[PDB]
């Protein structure tokens, strides 16, 4: 319990929601940062191709890898590469969004704006990438 990053769990358990945002941020980020650093250091040692390792290292890497996964904002990351694959602002320039990052109903209802511009490539863009459903796709192949 004397450990510097272990007492944070205790103070979280005892004090609780009466604390402000910054203190919760510190007490919850310490452990995550430590775990991430350990994971990186441990992954950085082994090889890449899984046909060149022993079974213990294979299972260890499989178990340890999941701590680094990302699931939500993949589209924004991958947007860059598709641009070069196919080819070869300051918010105000966007339509439907005010400077305060809120929707502009006046333009939406008057100018008849078809689409709201979240990211780039909303302006023009013939790449498509249209949303589909996993279950219908799975039923297609079978």
């Amino acid at each position: 319990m004397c450990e510097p990053v272990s007492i944070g769990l205790g103070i979280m358990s005892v004090a609780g929601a009466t604390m402000s945002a910054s203190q919760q941020a510190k007490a919850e980020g310490a452990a995550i940062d430590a775990q991430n650093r350990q994971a990186q250091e441990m992954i950085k040692q082994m090889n890449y191709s899984d046909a060149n390792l022993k079974m213990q290292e294979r299972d260890l890497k499989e178990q340890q890898m999941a701590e680094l996964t990302e699931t939500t904002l993949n589209g924004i990351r991958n947007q860059g590469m598709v641009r070069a694959a196919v080819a070869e602002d300051t918010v105000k320039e966007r339509a439907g969004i005010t400077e305060s990052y809120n929707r502009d109903y006046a333009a939406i209802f008057g100018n008849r704006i078809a689409n709201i511009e979240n990211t780039q490539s909303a302006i023009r863009g013939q790449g498509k990438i249209i949303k589909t459903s996993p279950l219908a796709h799975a039923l297609n192949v079978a």
Binding site: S13, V14, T18
Partner: protein, 34 residues
């Protein structure tokens, strides 16, 4: 006299699966030699 605070775990995926069989009839031999 205390105010516990819960947390939100990160979702994890390992592909969905139906429930396994009881007998699980599999290959009779062990090893790649045949």
């Amino acid at each position: 006299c205390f105010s516990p605070k819960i947390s939100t775990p990160k979702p994890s995926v390992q592909a969905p699966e139906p429930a396994p069989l009881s007998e699980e009839v599999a290959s009779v031999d062990i090893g790649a030699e045949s």
